[PDB]
Amino acid sequence: STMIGRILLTVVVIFRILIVAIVGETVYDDEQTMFVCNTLQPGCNQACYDRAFPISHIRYWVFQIIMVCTPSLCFITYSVHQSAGISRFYIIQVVFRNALEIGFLVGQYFLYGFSVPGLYECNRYPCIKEVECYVSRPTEKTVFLVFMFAVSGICVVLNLAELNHLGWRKIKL
Amino acid sequence: STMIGRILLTVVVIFRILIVAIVGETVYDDEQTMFVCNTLQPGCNQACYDRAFPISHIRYWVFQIIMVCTPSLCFITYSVHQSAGISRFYIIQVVFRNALEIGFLVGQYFLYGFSVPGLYECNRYPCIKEVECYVSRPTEKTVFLVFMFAVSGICVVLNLAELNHLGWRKIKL
Amino acid sequence: STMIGRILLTVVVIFRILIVAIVGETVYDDEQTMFVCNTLQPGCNQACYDRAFPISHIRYWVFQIIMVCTPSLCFITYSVHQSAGISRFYIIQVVFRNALEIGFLVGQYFLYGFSVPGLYECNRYPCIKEVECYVSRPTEKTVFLVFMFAVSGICVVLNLAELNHLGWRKIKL
Amino acid sequence: STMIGRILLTVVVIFRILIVAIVGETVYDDEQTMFVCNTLQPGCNQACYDRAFPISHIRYWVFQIIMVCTPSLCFITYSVHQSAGISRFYIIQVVFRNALEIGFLVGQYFLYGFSVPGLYECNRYPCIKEVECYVSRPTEKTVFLVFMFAVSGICVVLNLAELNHLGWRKIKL
Amino acid sequence: STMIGRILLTVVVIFRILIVAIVGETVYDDEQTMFVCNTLQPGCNQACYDRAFPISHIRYWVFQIIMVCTPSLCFITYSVHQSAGISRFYIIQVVFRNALEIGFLVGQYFLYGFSVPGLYECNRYPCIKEVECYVSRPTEKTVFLVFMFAVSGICVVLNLAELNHLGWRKIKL
Amino acid sequence: STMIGRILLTVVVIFRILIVAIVGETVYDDEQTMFVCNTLQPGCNQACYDRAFPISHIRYWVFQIIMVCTPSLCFITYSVHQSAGISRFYIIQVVFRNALEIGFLVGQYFLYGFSVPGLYECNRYPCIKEVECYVSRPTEKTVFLVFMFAVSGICVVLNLAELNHLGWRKIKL
Ligand SMILES: O[C@H](c1cc(C(F)(F)F)nc2c(C(F)(F)F)cccc12)[C@@H]1CCCCN1
Ligand SMILES: O[C@H](c1cc(C(F)(F)F)nc2c(C(F)(F)F)cccc12)[C@@H]1CCCCN1
Ligand SMILES: O[C@H](c1cc(C(F)(F)F)nc2c(C(F)(F)F)cccc12)[C@@H]1CCCCN1
Ligand SMILES: O[C@H](c1cc(C(F)(F)F)nc2c(C(F)(F)F)cccc12)[C@@H]1CCCCN1
Ligand SMILES: O[C@H](c1cc(C(F)(F)F)nc2c(C(F)(F)F)cccc12)[C@@H]1CCCCN1
Ligand SMILES: O[C@H](c1cc(C(F)(F)F)nc2c(C(F)(F)F)cccc12)[C@@H]1CCCCN1
């Protein structure tokens, strides 16, 4: 079943790209403008938002998508260069894709977890002692996080299946 | 009368895609900025809006449209792969499209109902006791909800008609 | 003189599409942000705006344009399907176009009238008793309404002329 | 001189289209948000802005550009219809273009004049007695007005030159 | 070495177009929104901004780019018309391009100078007596001004070099 | 191993362009609107922001990308001109690309350093004495700065490898 796997992998990749490109930017548009803290201290909002969300989910996902697409670009550009052999570059491409996908999945888990809480406790200067801040659209962002994790897991499973189909001996040699 | 069924199904799909892509984003642009609650508590607006609208209608509809289009993408990519058999894949594609359409229709009904009320009663922290909040353009959103439900129902009916035309004994084998 | 009728109908259809697509969205951008009521009651602005403009003109016109274009899409897709009889489908397409255009013209008349007043009287909860609200750029919207009505009327006249040229007997059979 | 005339006319038309499409929308973006009146009366700003600028310059110019391009569209569509005589249609097209250009130039002069003043005196309800309002970017709008008038005048002159070259007797039809 | 002159001129023109189109609009987006005057007079901000920046740099540069591109469009349209002689039109096009570029460079210098100050002294009605206003991103705008002046100077030098590489006696005839 | 060098260089260039074009503008959208200083002095925010960020990172990076791409455009246009020799131009193109890349990397290091602090101390007129200002999303901008520096360093290394592969005696002649 080395063909159905490829079909599903291509479809899933296109699905992820389309979903992100269409809705992600809109979801995270008012992330800072609607972030509010219970305080009168100027600059507390900026510091607390920066501490709560060091990197927005959307930018992480864009970086992941481009990086995961990169090895296919390498293979295609090499194929173009060859004309005006290739059977070897394919295995390395698959291995690198596997490694990148697994790394990005683990990175997402360790960076963001599985949920976006509605409240945040912030004790960064210039905020006095500890203050409470309130997040915008926590539930939608939690749903997006879980959905992206699931799609990435499906991609990892399909890539591993293809790699196992290729075989240990071919990879090692 | 299966050919006219395909013609109408294609036209309805294109119509739904065009309507959503052109107006949906504009309709729901100020959903949170014009959402206001009668209170002085910081962060009550954010929590109450998140509780009232866990997932925006537009994002659900975009997800539904892409997911419903997915099986056709699978079939097309399989056909491309085969050249440089197909009669069987068509029935499975039709069945999966039917299932996805029915599931998304039921999900819309159970998530959103048939109307968007103008008032919302909210009792989520940090709001004190129970507060009243006011929604932005509820009537237009209700019209959009009903229209999308009707279009999805028409799509479901056409898909069922085509599947019945195929007959039970081809699906079984 | 059926040929000049077709030429003019195509030209006016393109003209309406271009005008709407280029200006309509910008005309109605600040419809709600610039809508203000003389009151201190939270939520009165939202309710009064929703009551005054249940559906924006621009969205009604977009729906009308797509719906009126739909029969041509049906005919074109049927023609594509036939290649890899047609004379009968043309008359049905013309009749359906006539009906849709007339229906949308009547609907516009009964929904919006011929003018957008600068003042609105609103007595919807939570507004206390009856309040006065002020509309954004009413004159431009009135001009747009009248222009769209005139263009739709011209389209109706041309469609009726073409249908009359076809003849009653052909329509019956 | 008939050839260089057409060359210049085409170049000038393209120039006008490009200038408007690129800068006009940006110039008139904050026309209402930056329009302020010296008053405390709710709704005075909206009424006075509507009175001062019943139709924005940009929308008038877009309408003029599309309407002036329409006769060429009619001629092109007629030519397409003929293939799968034309000498006659060209003269009528030129005459109609002349008439439309002259009409739009006169309309601009009578609607807007040659300058946008920085102050406006407004006595429309709900404003009490008479109030002073202040316009946004009056000088840039005046420059745009004069430039568009000059370009339209050049177009009118070129069209009249072409019409004269055609001759009275040929157009006597 | 005329050929490398053509390469350099073309690449410089493309570079200017790309830089302006990509960054200029974003640089001058908040020119008026972030313009502040130390006063309580309503309407003083509008008048002071209008007197300080009668025409935005970006619009002047767009006008310059389109105008300097125009003669090439004239030449290309003439060439297209010729098929379904040319060696002569080219020198006139070169001369006109050179004159236009020099004129726009001189106009830039005489209209904006070489710097954008952070402070402005405004003395225009309705501002009481003399007021002080503060500009948005003066340093970035100064850098943009100097860069555009340098690019235009390079274009002027290359145009003169091309004109000389042709020679005086062909220009005379 | 010069071919893999070219493959990697092309892929890295495309990667940088895509990342910047997709996320950079959104990262720096609210750089000035969310910049706040602890003061009551009008115009202090503008002056302090202008002093802290004379040129935005995004515009510097756009300029760098276009400038680094320029030599390839020169080579391509020269090749186009030659048809309706080239071996020499390639070496000069490579040398100029190397010089531009190194210069832009050094310029970035000397202009911005390796971090964006969350606090800024500002003593520019009209601010009284010395005030404290707070930056918007400093952490994301720090990450972007470091990532761009790393990508530019990789490009420099690949360019140096290719230039060394060409060797000194070819460059000298
Ligand atoms: O410009 C934005 C965008 C473009 C593109 C691309 F150029 F690759 F097609 N990719 C995007 C992505 C990406 F696909 F993950 F790369 C995410 C978010 C916005 C994207 C989108 C495009 C759709 C409409 C909203 N902005
Ligand atoms: O980028 C937005 C958008 C694009 C596209 C797509 F790229 F697939 F064509 N699909 C959209 C959809 C759709 F449902 F996926 F079709 C919904 C809302 C906005 C969409 C729209 C496009 C029209 C102008 C407003 N933004
Ligand atoms: O995306 C918007 C838009 C697109 C399109 C379409 F995709 F069919 F071409 N149709 C639009 C329509 C139309 F009526 F469907 F033609 C109305 C308003 C905006 C439209 C416009 C397009 C021009 C620039 C402003 N947004
Ligand atoms: O969508 C807007 C627009 C488009 C077009 C068209 F689709 F015909 F090319 N024409 C426009 C016009 C024009 F006059 F019809 F040319 C004016 C203003 C904006 C226009 C512009 C396009 C350039 C970027 C800013 N919006
Ligand atoms: O619509 C804007 C724009 C377009 C164009 C054109 F249509 F000719 F390609 N030219 C622009 C110019 C230019 F100088 F005419 F090239 C300047 C500024 C913005 C421009 C840009 C295009 C890139 C993305 C930001 N808006
Ligand atoms: O118009 C913006 C943009 C365009 C382009 C170009 F026209 F060259 F492709 N280049 C951009 C660049 C680039 F560095 F020049 F590539 C940076 C930031 C935004 C860019 C982007 C394009 C993708 C969607 C968001 N705006």
PDB file of C-alpha atoms in Angstrom, chain A:
ATOM      1  CA  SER A   1       0.000   0.000   0.000  1.00  0.00           C
ATOM      2  CA  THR A   2       2.780   2.414  -0.950  1.00  0.00           C
ATOM      3  CA  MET A   3       0.511   4.389  -3.318  1.00  0.00           C
ATOM      4  CA  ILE A   4      -2.544   5.112  -1.162  1.00  0.00           C
ATOM      5  CA  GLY A   5      -0.080   6.388   1.428  1.00  0.00           C
ATOM      6  CA  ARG A   6       1.381   8.895  -1.023  1.00  0.00           C
ATOM      7  CA  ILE A   7      -2.087  10.014  -2.134  1.00  0.00           C
ATOM      8  CA  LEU A   8      -3.215  10.568   1.454  1.00  0.00           C
ATOM      9  CA  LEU A   9       0.009  12.360   2.391  1.00  0.00           C
ATOM     10  CA  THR A  10      -0.297  14.794  -0.512  1.00  0.00           C
ATOM     11  CA  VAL A  11      -3.963  15.457   0.251  1.00  0.00           C
ATOM     12  CA  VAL A  12      -3.263  16.042   3.950  1.00  0.00           C
ATOM     13  CA  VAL A  13      -0.390  18.427   3.195  1.00  0.00           C
ATOM     14  CA  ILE A  14      -2.582  20.453   0.838  1.00  0.00           C
ATOM     15  CA  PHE A  15      -5.383  20.445   3.420  1.00  0.00           C
ATOM     16  CA  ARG A  16      -3.114  21.810   6.149  1.00  0.00           C
ATOM     17  CA  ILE A  17      -1.713  24.509   3.870  1.00  0.00           C
ATOM     18  CA  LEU A  18      -5.176  25.635   2.768  1.00  0.00           C
ATOM     19  CA  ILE A  19      -6.650  25.711   6.275  1.00  0.00           C
ATOM     20  CA  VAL A  20      -3.754  27.699   7.714  1.00  0.00           C
ATOM     21  CA  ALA A  21      -3.500  30.135   4.806  1.00  0.00           C
ATOM     22  CA  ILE A  22      -7.233  30.849   4.865  1.00  0.00           C
ATOM     23  CA  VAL A  23      -8.140  31.113   8.573  1.00  0.00           C
ATOM     24  CA  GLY A  24      -4.979  31.360  10.699  1.00  0.00           C
ATOM     25  CA  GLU A  25      -4.174  35.017  10.082  1.00  0.00           C
ATOM     26  CA  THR A  26      -7.770  36.041  10.789  1.00  0.00           C
ATOM     27  CA  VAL A  27      -7.898  34.033  14.025  1.00  0.00           C
ATOM     28  CA  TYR A  28      -4.812  35.729  15.499  1.00  0.00           C
ATOM     29  CA  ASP A  29      -5.439  39.248  14.179  1.00  0.00           C
ATOM     30  CA  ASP A  30      -6.583  40.833  17.468  1.00  0.00           C
ATOM     31  CA  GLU A  31      -4.332  38.795  19.771  1.00  0.00           C
ATOM     32  CA  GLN A  32      -2.713  41.887  21.309  1.00  0.00           C
ATOM     33  CA  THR A  33      -5.443  44.504  20.829  1.00  0.00           C
ATOM     34  CA  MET A  34      -7.935  42.384  22.804  1.00  0.00           C
ATOM     35  CA  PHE A  35      -5.384  41.346  25.454  1.00  0.00           C
ATOM     36  CA  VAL A  36      -6.148  43.290  28.640  1.00  0.00           C
ATOM     37  CA  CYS A  37      -4.746  43.260  32.178  1.00  0.00           C
ATOM     38  CA  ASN A  38      -6.327  44.517  35.406  1.00  0.00           C
ATOM     39  CA  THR A  39      -3.920  47.360  36.136  1.00  0.00           C
ATOM     40  CA  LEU A  40      -3.241  51.065  35.694  1.00  0.00           C
ATOM     41  CA  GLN A  41       0.502  50.671  35.071  1.00  0.00           C
ATOM     42  CA  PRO A  42       1.578  51.850  31.595  1.00  0.00           C
ATOM     43  CA  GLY A  43       3.453  49.133  29.737  1.00  0.00           C
ATOM     44  CA  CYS A  44       2.112  46.234  31.811  1.00  0.00           C
ATOM     45  CA  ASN A  45      -0.071  45.038  28.927  1.00  0.00           C
ATOM     46  CA  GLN A  46       2.858  44.844  26.506  1.00  0.00           C
ATOM     47  CA  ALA A  47       5.162  43.014  28.916  1.00  0.00           C
ATOM     48  CA  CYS A  48       2.494  40.543  30.016  1.00  0.00           C
ATOM     49  CA  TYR A  49       1.426  39.777  26.448  1.00  0.00           C
ATOM     50  CA  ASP A  50       5.044  39.259  25.404  1.00  0.00           C
ATOM     51  CA  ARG A  51       5.610  36.883  28.320  1.00  0.00           C
ATOM     52  CA  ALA A  52       2.382  34.954  27.696  1.00  0.00           C
ATOM     53  CA  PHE A  53       2.886  34.482  23.928  1.00  0.00           C
ATOM     54  CA  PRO A  54       6.591  34.772  23.046  1.00  0.00           C
ATOM     55  CA  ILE A  55       5.867  33.496  19.522  1.00  0.00           C
ATOM     56  CA  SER A  56       2.392  33.407  18.010  1.00  0.00           C
ATOM     57  CA  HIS A  57       1.065  30.020  16.938  1.00  0.00           C
ATOM     58  CA  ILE A  58       0.465  31.221  13.376  1.00  0.00           C
ATOM     59  CA  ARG A  59       4.101  32.177  12.775  1.00  0.00           C
ATOM     60  CA  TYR A  60       5.323  28.875  14.211  1.00  0.00           C
ATOM     61  CA  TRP A  61       2.968  26.975  11.905  1.00  0.00           C
ATOM     62  CA  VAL A  62       4.010  29.001   8.848  1.00  0.00           C
ATOM     63  CA  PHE A  63       7.662  28.297   9.623  1.00  0.00           C
ATOM     64  CA  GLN A  64       6.888  24.601  10.086  1.00  0.00           C
ATOM     65  CA  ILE A  65       4.991  24.372   6.792  1.00  0.00           C
ATOM     66  CA  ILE A  66       7.740  26.043   4.765  1.00  0.00           C
ATOM     67  CA  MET A  67      10.487  24.013   6.445  1.00  0.00           C
ATOM     68  CA  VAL A  68       8.644  20.730   5.864  1.00  0.00           C
ATOM     69  CA  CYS A  69       8.136  21.666   2.209  1.00  0.00           C
ATOM     70  CA  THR A  70      11.834  22.539   1.787  1.00  0.00           C
ATOM     71  CA  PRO A  71      13.203  19.001   1.110  1.00  0.00           C
ATOM     72  CA  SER A  72      10.765  18.522  -1.769  1.00  0.00           C
ATOM     73  CA  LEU A  73      12.029  21.825  -3.168  1.00  0.00           C
ATOM     74  CA  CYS A  74      15.603  20.551  -2.877  1.00  0.00           C
ATOM     75  CA  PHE A  75      14.695  17.360  -4.738  1.00  0.00           C
ATOM     76  CA  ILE A  76      12.802  19.204  -7.484  1.00  0.00           C
ATOM     77  CA  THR A  77      15.592  21.733  -8.014  1.00  0.00           C
ATOM     78  CA  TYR A  78      18.178  18.936  -8.147  1.00  0.00           C
ATOM     79  CA  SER A  79      16.067  17.107 -10.733  1.00  0.00           C
ATOM     80  CA  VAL A  80      15.832  20.291 -12.810  1.00  0.00           C
ATOM     81  CA  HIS A  81      19.596  20.809 -12.548  1.00  0.00           C
ATOM     82  CA  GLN A  82      20.327  17.239 -13.655  1.00  0.00           C
ATOM     83  CA  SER A  83      18.430  17.701 -16.934  1.00  0.00           C
ATOM     84  CA  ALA A  84      20.098  20.342 -19.112  1.00  0.00           C
ATOM     85  CA  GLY A  85      21.075   8.957  -9.513  1.00  0.00           C
ATOM     86  CA  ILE A  86      17.737  10.539  -8.652  1.00  0.00           C
ATOM     87  CA  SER A  87      16.651   7.240  -7.089  1.00  0.00           C
ATOM     88  CA  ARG A  88      19.133   7.907  -4.271  1.00  0.00           C
ATOM     89  CA  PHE A  89      18.129  11.486  -3.435  1.00  0.00           C
ATOM     90  CA  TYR A  90      14.545  10.318  -2.863  1.00  0.00           C
ATOM     91  CA  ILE A  91      15.429   8.232   0.201  1.00  0.00           C
ATOM     92  CA  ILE A  92      17.382  11.076   1.815  1.00  0.00           C
ATOM     93  CA  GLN A  93      14.488  13.425   1.050  1.00  0.00           C
ATOM     94  CA  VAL A  94      12.050  11.078   2.790  1.00  0.00           C
ATOM     95  CA  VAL A  95      14.310  10.671   5.830  1.00  0.00           C
ATOM     96  CA  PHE A  96      14.791  14.425   6.210  1.00  0.00           C
ATOM     97  CA  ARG A  97      11.046  15.010   5.872  1.00  0.00           C
ATOM     98  CA  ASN A  98      10.422  12.447   8.617  1.00  0.00           C
ATOM     99  CA  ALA A  99      12.956  14.075  10.929  1.00  0.00           C
ATOM    100  CA  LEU A 100      11.621  17.589  10.342  1.00  0.00           C
ATOM    101  CA  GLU A 101       7.997  16.566  10.902  1.00  0.00           C
ATOM    102  CA  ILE A 102       8.794  14.742  14.144  1.00  0.00           C
ATOM    103  CA  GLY A 103      10.928  17.615  15.400  1.00  0.00           C
ATOM    104  CA  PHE A 104       8.241  20.200  14.705  1.00  0.00           C
ATOM    105  CA  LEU A 105       5.545  18.089  16.378  1.00  0.00           C
ATOM    106  CA  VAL A 106       7.670  17.685  19.512  1.00  0.00           C
ATOM    107  CA  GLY A 107       8.514  21.383  19.447  1.00  0.00           C
ATOM    108  CA  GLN A 108       4.847  22.344  19.286  1.00  0.00           C
ATOM    109  CA  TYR A 109       4.050  20.073  22.219  1.00  0.00           C
ATOM    110  CA  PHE A 110       6.850  21.496  24.363  1.00  0.00           C
ATOM    111  CA  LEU A 111       6.198  25.127  23.398  1.00  0.00           C
ATOM    112  CA  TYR A 112       2.407  25.400  23.621  1.00  0.00           C
ATOM    113  CA  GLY A 113       0.982  22.257  25.194  1.00  0.00           C
ATOM    114  CA  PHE A 114      -2.597  21.332  24.340  1.00  0.00           C
ATOM    115  CA  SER A 115      -4.655  24.313  25.546  1.00  0.00           C
ATOM    116  CA  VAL A 116      -4.735  28.108  25.738  1.00  0.00           C
ATOM    117  CA  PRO A 117      -6.021  29.216  29.173  1.00  0.00           C
ATOM    118  CA  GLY A 118      -8.377  32.164  29.456  1.00  0.00           C
ATOM    119  CA  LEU A 119      -6.485  33.718  32.380  1.00  0.00           C
ATOM    120  CA  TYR A 120      -2.792  34.518  32.731  1.00  0.00           C
ATOM    121  CA  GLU A 121      -0.838  35.424  35.871  1.00  0.00           C
ATOM    122  CA  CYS A 122       1.899  37.950  35.099  1.00  0.00           C
ATOM    123  CA  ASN A 123       4.670  39.294  37.342  1.00  0.00           C
ATOM    124  CA  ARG A 124       6.986  41.017  34.856  1.00  0.00           C
ATOM    125  CA  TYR A 125       8.280  44.552  35.269  1.00  0.00           C
ATOM    126  CA  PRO A 126       6.765  47.182  35.206  1.00  0.00           C
ATOM    127  CA  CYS A 127       3.725  45.336  36.600  1.00  0.00           C
ATOM    128  CA  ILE A 128       3.480  45.678  40.380  1.00  0.00           C
ATOM    129  CA  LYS A 129       3.683  42.326  42.202  1.00  0.00           C
ATOM    130  CA  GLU A 130       1.354  39.927  40.312  1.00  0.00           C
ATOM    131  CA  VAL A 131      -1.492  40.873  37.965  1.00  0.00           C
ATOM    132  CA  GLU A 132      -4.229  39.015  36.102  1.00  0.00           C
ATOM    133  CA  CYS A 133      -4.599  39.261  32.321  1.00  0.00           C
ATOM    134  CA  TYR A 134      -7.343  37.988  30.029  1.00  0.00           C
ATOM    135  CA  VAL A 135      -6.833  36.300  26.667  1.00  0.00           C
ATOM    136  CA  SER A 136      -8.771  36.726  23.420  1.00  0.00           C
ATOM    137  CA  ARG A 137     -10.565  33.746  21.845  1.00  0.00           C
ATOM    138  CA  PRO A 138      -8.932  31.074  24.056  1.00  0.00           C
ATOM    139  CA  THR A 139     -11.309  28.314  22.925  1.00  0.00           C
ATOM    140  CA  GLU A 140     -10.820  28.859  19.190  1.00  0.00           C
ATOM    141  CA  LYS A 141      -7.046  28.884  19.649  1.00  0.00           C
ATOM    142  CA  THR A 142      -7.225  25.675  21.693  1.00  0.00           C
ATOM    143  CA  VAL A 143      -9.237  24.031  18.908  1.00  0.00           C
ATOM    144  CA  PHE A 144      -6.721  25.227  16.315  1.00  0.00           C
ATOM    145  CA  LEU A 145      -3.823  23.902  18.402  1.00  0.00           C
ATOM    146  CA  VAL A 146      -5.389  20.454  18.763  1.00  0.00           C
ATOM    147  CA  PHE A 147      -6.325  20.298  15.074  1.00  0.00           C
ATOM    148  CA  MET A 148      -2.799  21.188  13.960  1.00  0.00           C
ATOM    149  CA  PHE A 149      -1.355  18.588  16.324  1.00  0.00           C
ATOM    150  CA  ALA A 150      -3.668  15.925  14.885  1.00  0.00           C
ATOM    151  CA  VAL A 151      -2.804  16.801  11.281  1.00  0.00           C
ATOM    152  CA  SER A 152       0.920  16.759  12.049  1.00  0.00           C
ATOM    153  CA  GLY A 153       0.539  13.380  13.743  1.00  0.00           C
ATOM    154  CA  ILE A 154      -1.209  11.971  10.680  1.00  0.00           C
ATOM    155  CA  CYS A 155       1.611  13.294   8.494  1.00  0.00           C
ATOM    156  CA  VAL A 156       4.201  11.693  10.785  1.00  0.00           C
ATOM    157  CA  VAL A 157       2.398   8.345  10.672  1.00  0.00           C
ATOM    158  CA  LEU A 158       2.184   8.380   6.872  1.00  0.00           C
ATOM    159  CA  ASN A 159       5.850   9.355   6.531  1.00  0.00           C
ATOM    160  CA  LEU A 160       6.883   6.557   8.897  1.00  0.00           C
ATOM    161  CA  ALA A 161       4.793   4.073   6.919  1.00  0.00           C
ATOM    162  CA  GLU A 162       6.485   5.111   3.675  1.00  0.00           C
ATOM    163  CA  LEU A 163       9.929   4.916   5.292  1.00  0.00           C
ATOM    164  CA  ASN A 164       9.214   1.417   6.607  1.00  0.00           C
ATOM    165  CA  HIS A 165       8.021   0.433   3.137  1.00  0.00           C
ATOM    166  CA  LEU A 166      11.351   1.579   1.693  1.00  0.00           C
ATOM    167  CA  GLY A 167      13.163  -0.745   4.082  1.00  0.00           C
ATOM    168  CA  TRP A 168      16.069  -0.674   6.519  1.00  0.00           C
ATOM    169  CA  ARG A 169      18.565  -2.115   4.031  1.00  0.00           C
ATOM    170  CA  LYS A 170      17.990   0.542   1.362  1.00  0.00           C
ATOM    171  CA  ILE A 171      18.281   3.377   3.887  1.00  0.00           C
ATOM    172  CA  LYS A 172      21.444   2.040   5.517  1.00  0.00           C
ATOM    173  CA  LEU A 173      23.359   1.365   2.293  1.00  0.00           C
TER     174      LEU A 173
END
